[PDB]
Write a protein that binds this ligand. Structure first.
Ligand SMILES: Cc1cc2nc3c(=O)[nH]c(=O)nc-3n(C[C@H](O)[C@H](O)[C@H](O)COP(=O)(O)O)c2cc1C
Ligand code: SF4
Ligand code: SF4
Ligand code: SF4
Ligand code: FES
Ligand code: FES
Ligand SMILES: [Ca+2]
Lengths: 156, 148, 905
């Protein structure tokens, strides 16, 4: 049983005002639900579709198209390490190995206490300061495998 | 800019109305392709579209639409302020104006510098990027991103 | 436009793309994502050809032929080396993940992907890595889902969402993990979901009803036939194997249904395979039932009929023209009765009078898609005439088509057309007792009683033309909506008015005729469509006869002591108590039918008639087109004890045995000539198909593919001696593969599409003049009547507004595509799809009765106190109860009737 909160519904309608078609608010409606609840659960697809007046199949096609809209439950903090070409040259593999050793999980997995979800991501547009990674809204550059356990500890 | 009359209704008393919005993405590389950008702005899956028709005649929601890069739109105000003749005489090359160029990846000074068109890649690599790092020999380079 | 293909000059349409132009010329270009009805999108990249700007150009460039206009002066090569290598590479890329599934795949031998793999010449696998896999979904009882076989051609979503306006199918995921299906498990809710099995070029979407008793396409015995499940008359290709009807495929008719059926026609055929069907004539002696052969049945029935003082006949709209005529000849014209009720007959003859005397052209089903504004009055088209609802959706998309044509966008560039149009569409106004499935695209929906819908129509006609009679007592809000409808219809270049007999009111048909007349008087190109109930309702109305009530009172007064009932259960058109009493009073009841009906418990003789799969005949659809259906198989080929004949054959031999004491089994063309000699209004049924002497260069038309298998084994358990193939003296088709099915054969009746290299439904390309157009020697079927020179007068009988009165409940008809048709609701696959029985109530009326949603209420109609659970209907107007017509115990004659003693029990 999914119900959109008042804050979620008002945010979705306010974003509906920004376009000439309410369908154009589907991505940000999914992002609003994800920001409130960590991810987009299954009933949120039908709730968002009902608010925007578009089919649930379109909402789910959007949600499963875009990589940053999570349709599976994640941890409290999403680590997104860049695995693209410049960070590969700058040695993201050591960063990924350090993250895997500290968290004892694989990419795409969530730690057993629900704290961290480790994810590869495409280039973060910070290639001159690589290797880069992204915790929830914070980007960390100039990464070394030694600074990974200290820098992960400030996200509780 | 909205507070100081530069955006919104009756900008500078000219009668021109302009609303500027920011649409934050949800993380796909294909969304940068202009027709897939238009599809993503419409709240759909970001597949590109066949051209013709180009977005200039039927783009976002079927309306005339122009998609331009950040740096292109950042180039236009200096053209409008300092004139066309200043912009043509920035460099003696077929490509007018200045381009943000740079070198990245195990160089001494990886970064980003505004340079006229026609500067050599060796000038960017050695004078600006500082050359390769110590103990590393130059093997290859990609000029313009991962797709070159 | 002149194009050059591989150094050969061709004359093509410049408004077409290169793929459809080259396929219309007989050239072979492989393709997946393009469809003639869906336009071009350029997804699969299979249709690559090399293009040259000049004749003196040798480099060229690979282009998509589906995305390239066939303009004047283009040079292309299909057989270029780079083009062939690229098309083979596209097939190979599709093969990298494709499962090793062809032996256990229902698409095998009918698969477009198999055909294009062979056509490109790709037969060697060098990919050595893993293949991606997908889980499947449960899509309901009709469509089986297997996503491993998907080639991501996007045809399913383009058809289902853009064409059919369905909402519950979509594409999910990303790069090589794209998934096509529903957002979750559940039944596909579109009434036209079944066309996915032919639209999908692979075995992802397959016919589950056929999959239960699966056979390959080469093993099938096909015939051209007409769907019997409603009045639209969509052309079908039924196919059988081992004596059972295995599958209903779409038979392409470029004038009626082209590529698409509805799900009632596609999946409601299962009543043909019921094990309780009569296979032999059976005579009742006391409590005993004795099986007779054909001659003893004819002799005994003729003896009892000779002893009888008056024999009356009761026809049916289920039966063909020839069967109803044969009954009419057996009993006499003055003793013939149509099997429908008096009100149903009045509405049907009024609809026929409007069609062939109103002076307004009635369009064919394909022509509906070209109209500019649609007004549907009373007729719940999606549940009663579903393919008309699909065609109306296309007509509504016509506005985006017009806007895109204004911007010089080609008509096959469907994505650009849809982008330009956005949400703009042509006006659609629908009226019903409740909400319709057309309300998503309707400009306005009027939920009102049938009298109020008729009054709205009369007001529309009066505002269009002041000579039309006025209706007083219209609210200003309803007046504003009326002016909206009037401004839409008056500005339309081609308005269309749809009505029919299913609303159960004469005044709705009269109001639709008044609106059409008012639009015609303004010099508009107005069309009118009437939706009838059954497959041959219009033919029965043209033939005419007394109502079922007159036959019942003739049997009840004792003036008739013998009744012959043809293909009629009699409970759908009259109260079962009255029918049972009248049939028990009659000393002789003969029932000629192919289904085990309830009136055979009192029948003294039951003649095992053939269904449409085992019979030939002619049916008249809702627009007056006579269409011939042909027998699919001989039911006595396996079971020699089966005596199952055409109804007209039974009744003609009965008349012969009654007159000259001798049996005459006759021929179909003799009966057709008798029809056109006796009834001049049915004279067009002679030209519906050529007679049985028609040949293609001396050879008959084959019913089964040339690779039909098992001839010396399929009957070998019965007897090791192979019999003769059953003979077809009735038609030009042969019950074997020893015949003609060439795509260039000069004929109109095509039993199935097959061409060398094209085993899928894409083989219909070779049978058309141009792809997506007409069959290349004309579509089968002929219109019985032309548009009359003069129209009718305005109907001045404007009804008063609906008034609720206490203790009296007006029955609002609720039709269901799965359930409201008698024979298809007998099919076992429809039982899961059929809704649970219910009674619809307004919230105010349910609160007044002290009744919540789900509680059972009991009501009495004609001595039948039945109980039904309550569903709350917001849109139903108070003073009405909604009833599902045509279900078990709810006859469609109850539409517009009243109800007493509705209480919670
Ligand atoms: C796959 C793909 C991704 C692209 N991503 C971007 C992008 O992220 N940003 C961008 O400005 N252009 C991107 N482009 C180029 C655009 O299609 C288009 O040329 C540009 O956005 C606007 O043109 P302009 O350079 O004249 O401003 C991409 C093109 C392709 C084919
Ligand atoms: S979809 Fe076609 S190619 Fe694939 S397994 Fe089925 S028959 Fe074979
Ligand atoms: S399911 Fe069928 S129609 Fe849909 S994309 Fe896949 S192969 Fe094409
Ligand atoms: S619309 Fe009517 S005639 Fe056509 S397939 Fe459906 S039930 Fe059959
Ligand atoms: S390559 Fe990693 S931030 Fe760009
Ligand atoms: S048929 Fe042309 S690209 Fe698919
Ligand atoms: Ca026959």
């Amino acid at each position: 049983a999914f119900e959109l909160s008042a804050a979620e519904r008002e945010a979705i309608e306010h974003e509906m005002h920004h376009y000439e078609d309410p369908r154009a608010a589907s991505i940000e409606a999914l992002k609003i639900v994800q920001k409130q609840r960590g991810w987009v659960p299954d009933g949120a697809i039908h709730a968002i579709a009902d608010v925007l007046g578009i089919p649930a199949s379109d909402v789910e096609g959007v949600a499963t198209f875009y990589s940053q809209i999570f349709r599976q439950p994640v941890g409290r903090h999403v680590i997104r390490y860049c695995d693209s070409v410049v960070c590969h040259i700058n040695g993201y593999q050591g960063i990924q190995a350090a993250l895997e050793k500290k968290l004892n999980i694989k990419p795409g997995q969530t730690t057993f206490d629900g704290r961290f979800t480790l994810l590869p991501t495409c280039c973060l547009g910070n290639c001159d300061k690589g290797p880069n990674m992204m915790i929830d809204e914070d980007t960390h550059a100039h990464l070394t495998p030694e600074a990974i356990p200290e820098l992960l500890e400030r996200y509780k | 800019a909205t507070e100081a009359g530069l955006l919104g209704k009756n900008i500078m008393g000219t009668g021109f109305d302009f609303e500027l919005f920011v649409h934050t993405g949800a993380g796909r590389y294909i969304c940068g392709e202009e027709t897939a950008l238009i599809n993503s702005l419409e709240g759909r899956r970001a597949n590109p579209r066949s051209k013709p028709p180009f977005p200039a005649t039927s783009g976002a929601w079927g309306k005339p639409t122009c998609v331009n890069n950040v740096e292109t739109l950042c180039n236009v105000p200096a053209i409008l302020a300092n004139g066309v003749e200043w912009y043509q005489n920035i460099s003696k090359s077929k490509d007018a104006g200045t381009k943000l160029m740079g070198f990245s990846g195990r160089v001494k000074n990886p970064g980003l510098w505004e340079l006229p068109f026609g500067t050599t890649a060796r000038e960017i690599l050695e004078d600006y990027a500082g050359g390769m790092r110590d103990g590393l020999k130059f093997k290859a380079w990609q000029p313009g991103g991962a797709g070159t | 436009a002149t194009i050059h293909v591989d150094g050969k000059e061709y004359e093509v349409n410049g408004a077409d793309n290169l793929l459809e132009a080259c396929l219309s010329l007989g050239l072979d270009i492989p393709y997946f994502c393009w469809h003639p009805a869906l336009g071009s999108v350029g997804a699969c990249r299979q249709c690559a050809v090399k293009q040259y700007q000049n004749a003196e150009d040798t480099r060229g460039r690979l282009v998509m032929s589906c995305m390239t206009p066939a303009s004047d002066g283009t040079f292309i090569s299909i057989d270029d080396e780079e083009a062939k290598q690229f098309r083979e590479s596209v097939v190979e890329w599709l093969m990298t993940n494709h499962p090793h599934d062809c032996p256990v795949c229902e698409e095998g031998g009918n698969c477009h992907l198999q055909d294009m793999t062979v056509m490109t010449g790709h037969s060697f696998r060098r990919y050595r890595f893993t293949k991606r896999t997908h889980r499947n979904q449960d899509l309901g009882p009709f469509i089986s889902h297997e996503m491993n076989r998907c080639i991501a051609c996007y045809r399913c979503v383009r058809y289902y969402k853009d064409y059919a306006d369905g909402t519950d199918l979509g594409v999910y995921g990303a790069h090589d993990n794209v998934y096509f299906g529903r957002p979750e498990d559940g039944t596909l809710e579109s009434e036209f979901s079944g066309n996915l099995v032919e639209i999908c070029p692979t075995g992802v979407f397959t016919d589950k009803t056929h999959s239960e008793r699966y056979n390959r396409k080469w093993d099938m015995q096909f015939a051209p036939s007409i769907c019997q499940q409603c009045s639209i008359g969509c052309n079908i290709s039924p196919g059988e194997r081992y004596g059972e009807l295995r599958r209903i495929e779409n038979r392409y008719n470029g004038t009626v249904n082209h590529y698409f059926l509805c799900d009632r026609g596609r999946f409601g055929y299962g009543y043909v395979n019921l094990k309780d069907r009569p296979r032999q004539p059976v005579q009742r002696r006391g409590d005993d039932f004795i099986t007779l052969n054909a001659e003893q049945a004819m002799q005994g029935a003729a003896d009892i009929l000779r002893q009888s003082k008056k024999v009356i006949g009761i026809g049916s709209p289920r039966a063909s023209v020839e069967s109803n005529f044969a009954l009419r000849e057996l009993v006499g014209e003055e003793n013939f009765y149509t099997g429908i009720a008096h009100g149903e007959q009045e509405r049907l003859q009024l609809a026929l009078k409007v069609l062939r005397e109103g002076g307004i052209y009635t369009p064919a089903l394909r022509e509906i898609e070209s109209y500019d504004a649609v007004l549907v009055l009373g007729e719940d088209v999606t549940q009663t005439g579903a393919r008309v609802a699909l065609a109306v959706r296309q007509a509504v998309k016509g506005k985006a088509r017009e806007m895109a044509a204004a911007q010089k966008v080609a008509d096959w560039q469907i994505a650009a057309i849809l982008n330009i149009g956005q949400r703009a569409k042509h006006p659609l106004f629908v009226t019903n007792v409740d909400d319709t499935r057309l309300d998503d695209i309707a400009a306005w929906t009027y939920r009102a009683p049938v009298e109020d819908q008729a009054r709205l129509g009369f007001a529309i006609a009066h505002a269009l033309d002041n000579s039309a009679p006025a209706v007083d007592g219209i609210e200003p809000e309803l007046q504003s909506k009326i002016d909206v409808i009037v401004q839409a219809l008056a500005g339309a270049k081609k308005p269309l008015i749809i009505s029919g007999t299913n609303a159960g009111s004469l005044e709705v048909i009269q109001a639709a005729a008044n609106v059409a007349k008012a639009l015609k008087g303004r010099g508009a190109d107005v069309g009118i469509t009437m939706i009838a109930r059954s497959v041959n309702s219009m033919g029965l109305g043209i033939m005419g006869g007394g109502s079922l009530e007159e036959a019942l009172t003739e049997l009840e007064t004792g003036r008739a002591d013998a009744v012959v009932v043809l293909e009629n259960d009699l409970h759908r058109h009259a109260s079962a108590i009255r029918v049972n009493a009248a049939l028990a009073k009659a000393p002789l009841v003969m029932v000629v039918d192919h289904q085990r009906t309830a009136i055979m418990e009192n029948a003294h003789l039951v003649l095992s008639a053939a269904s449409f799969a085992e019979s030939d005949g002619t049916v008249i659809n809702n627009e007056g087109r006579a269409q011939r259906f042909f027998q699919v198989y001989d039911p006595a080929y396996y079971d020699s004890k089966t005596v199952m004949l055409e109804s007209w054959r039974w009744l003609h031999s009965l008349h012969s045995t009654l007159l000259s004491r001798e049996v005459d089994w006759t021929q179909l063309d003799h009966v057709i000539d008798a029809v056109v000699a006796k009834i001049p209004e049915l004279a067009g049924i002679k030209d519906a198909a050529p007679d049985a002497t028609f040949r293609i260069r001396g050879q008959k038309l084959a019913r089964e593919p040339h690779r039909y298998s098992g001839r010396t084994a399929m009957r070998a358990n019965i007897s090791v001696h192979e019999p003769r193939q059953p003979q077809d003296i009735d038609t030009m088709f042969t019950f074997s593969m020893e015949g003609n099915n060439q795509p260039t054969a000069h004929r109109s009746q095509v039993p199935f599409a097959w061409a060398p290299g094209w085993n899928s439904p894409q083989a219909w390309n070779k049978f058309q003049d141009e792809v997506g157009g007409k069959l290349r020697f004309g579509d089968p079927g002929v219109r019985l009547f032309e548009t009359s020179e003069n129209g009718l007068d305005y109907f001045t009988s404007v009804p008063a507004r609906f008034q609720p009165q206490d203790g009296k409940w007006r029955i609002a008809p609720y039709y269901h595509l799965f359930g409201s048709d008698e024979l298809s609701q007998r099919a076992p696959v429809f039982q899961s799809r059929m809704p649970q029985p219910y009674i619809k109530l307004n919230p105010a009326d349910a609160a007044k009765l002290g009744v919540n949603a789900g509680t059972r209420v009991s009501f009495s109609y004609d001595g039948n106190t039945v109980t039904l659970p309550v569903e709350i209907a917001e849109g139903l107007t108070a003073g009405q109860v909604g009833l599902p017509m045509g279900m078990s115990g709810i006859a469609p004659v109850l539409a517009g009737a009243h109800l007493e003693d509705l209480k919670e029990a």
